[PDB]
């Protein structure tokens, strides 16, 4: 990402770019998004939350007018839009704000209302883990034994994000889809479930819990989840394909390199602190450098698709290249798709062109599994 | 507030509206905002040369991508790349002067990419040719071969080809189980290139499509966008085979729209006016305007007897909102089933032709029409 869409504040512009990308799949048009953004001063998180929260209100009011005619199709779309409008506001909401969980629950209710009015068979689930239950969504046809795709996010996602990132598209290509929030993600920190050293357990928990029609099970990790899935894929062999955007074998090194008045960055860092369960982002970083353990990628044997943008930290691209070179040497079926700027998909997690990366992923996955 | 109310990327208002419109197309089909903003990053504000070049080289880029991909036979992806390429070319065409040898060259390249995109998808769209005045009007159709579906005829204005009509409403018509016809009238698409220029009354041309079409049912609706809001008014005022009228926006007095509109350094408007003169078949846009002022006949809207839906943005010229209100009030006193939908700024759909939120506009159109037709 290195020219602006709307804001000079880089964090805000990236978020804005990302919110636009979502609208390509479900929810708000570029029209709504520029309308909302016209009320947002550059680098002002308070304006951001206010405008996005108000748009959600407008949309719920629309739902109430249109109900009076049971325009079913339309009600689902408005509910999705309202949901992702609250999601946008949440991105820059401080966990210490009383509004935070109120709004997080409001987002969740709206997501289910969109699904209630849709012809999508999505259901809420809870995966048992470490005494507690991890929140997730699942979409599974009752009548067909389909191959499964599990979607895992990074440090800025909830199960709702996993939906438009891959899960919905996965379902539309006839896969059973699970999208579960691991500790540290979504609202897990709110119940004492913070980022943990090894994601293998949580991910195996999900598989332990899932009674899979077929054995053809793929896992896809975005952002942070490129590290979490690397971890699962190393040790757990019922995973039959691995998609990572981007794959990470050593987070310690990613942090080390990265972190060697911006009110937007401040709220971001605070949310991270909350997800790690620490008092500082600074302390959180140390926790990582401290405990995060390097994946033994020479132990990965699975068909792999690595997705990486040209607007991507050079350390992320390095680790991607390492894994590519190593898997190729060893004759693992590996593909490294670089997304150039021209492609319009070069931003982290391919948010600036979800549609393209969906085609890439599923053309590849169809080949690996069906074929 | 001529075509929209909020600035997106460019200070030049014509270019900014076109850009908004190109973004909107991507919500339906083809390019992402990511692609569009990358492209735009290489365009100087109000420079239609930069615009044409960036968009043309983006199509070159996508077509190589397609080749690169053929080696693995990804249809869905290939089809998607062709659509993006097609509409990338279409974007460049918008600010291409038709006295350019590359105008028709690129126009045909667009049509080809459109067909290659369709051939790699599951949409059973066909290219058709409607007989009229001893010539043939290019169009597209999507028809069911077994099912007897109601029909939707889509009509554009001064800046559309068959191709635009597809995303604009036609493909949606299809997703909603209507038979769809998208036909370029004289003055539209490639028609001026074969000596078919804007004519005084669009009724004969629309009527020819109806003569040509063999309708599975008698439920036939017509939708007009921009200047098509006038063309379809002329038709609906005379031809009773039309059972429903959607207009964005409805126009009964086009001369007035012109007078009021046009009572240099803007190279964008300038090229676009040149395109108009070409469409009208006159030596320049001024002669063209005079032609309208002295020949365009006011529609006798008091004679219109059809369920009507008018779609108008809060971001639109007050003159078009005015004509829409006049019709609404007339139809309403006369007991016509008429609906006037104003799209607020907040809806994100308040630009001319609802380009900034096509999706919302599609919901509104097909919920209404299903109600009128069931
Ligand atoms: Mg590329
Ligand atoms: Mg509105």
TrEMBL record, chain B:
<feature type="domain" description="Serine aminopeptidase S33">
    <location>
        <begin position="175"/>
        <end position="333"/>
    </location>
</feature>
<dbReference type="GO" id="GO:0006508">
    <property type="term" value="P:proteolysis"/>
</dbReference>
<dbReference type="Pfam" id="PF12146">
    <property type="entry name" value="Hydrolase_4"/>
</dbReference>
<dbReference type="GO" id="GO:0004252">
    <property type="term" value="F:serine-type endopeptidase activity"/>
</dbReference>
<dbReference type="InterPro" id="IPR002471">
    <property type="entry name" value="Pept_S9_AS"/>
</dbReference>
<dbReference type="InterPro" id="IPR022742">
    <property type="entry name" value="Hydrolase_4"/>
</dbReference>
<protein>
    <recommendedName>
        <fullName>Serine aminopeptidase S33 domain-containing protein</fullName>
    </recommendedName>
</protein>
<dbReference type="InterPro" id="IPR029058">
    <property type="entry name" value="AB_hydrolase_fold"/>
</dbReference>
<keyword id="KW-0378">Hydrolase</keyword>
């Amino acid at each position: 990402q290195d020219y602006k869409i709307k804001f000079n504040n880089k964090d805000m512009d990236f978020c804005f770019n990302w919110m636009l990308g979502i609208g390509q799949i479900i929810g708000m048009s570029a029209g709504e998004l520029f309308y909302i953004a016209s009320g947002i001063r550059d680098g002002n998180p308070t304006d951001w939350c206010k405008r996005f929260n108000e748009h959600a209100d407008y949309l719920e009011d629309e739902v109430e007018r249109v109900k009076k005619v049971g325009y079913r199709d339309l009600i689902s779309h408005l509910y999705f839009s309202a949901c992702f409008s609250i999601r946008a506001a949440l991105q820059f909401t401080d966990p210490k704000d009383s509004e935070f969980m109120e709004n997080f629950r409001r987002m969740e209710k709206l997501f289910m209302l969109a699904v209630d009015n849709s012809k999508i068979p999505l259901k809420s689930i809870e995966v048992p883990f470490e005494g507690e239950l991890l929140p997730g969504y699942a979409i599974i046809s009752e009548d067909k034994a389909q191959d499964t795709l599990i979607v895992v996010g990074g440090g800025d996602t909830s199960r709702e994000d996993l939906f438009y990132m891959l899960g919905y598209s996965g379902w539309e290509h006839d896969y059973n889809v699970l999208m579960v929030d691991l500790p540290g993600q979504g609202k897990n920190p709110n119940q004492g479930l913070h980022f943990e050293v090894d994601a293998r357990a949580a991910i195996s928990a999900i598989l332990d819990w899932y009674q899979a029609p077929t054995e053809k099970i793929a896992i896809a990790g975005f952002s942070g989840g490129g590290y979490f899935t690397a971890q699962a894929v190393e040790k757990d062999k019922r995973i039959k394909a691995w998609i990572a955007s981007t794959p990470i074998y050593d987070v310690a090194e990613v942090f080390r390199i990265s972190f060697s008045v911006n009110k937007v960055a401040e709220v971001n860092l605070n949310k991270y602190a909350w997800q790690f369960g620490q008092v500082d982002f600074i302390t959180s970083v140390n926790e990582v450098l401290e405990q995060a353990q390097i994946v033994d990628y020479n132990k990965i044997d699975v068909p792999s698709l690595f997705l990486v943008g040209a607007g991507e930290d050079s350390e992320l691209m390095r680790q991607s290249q390492v894994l590519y070179d190593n898997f190729k040497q060893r004759g693992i079926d590996v593909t490294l798709r670089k997304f150039s700027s021209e492609s319009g998909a070069d931003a982290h997690c391919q948010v600036n062109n979800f549609r393209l990366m969906h085609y890439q992923v599923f053309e590849w996955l169809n080949h690996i599994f069906k074929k």
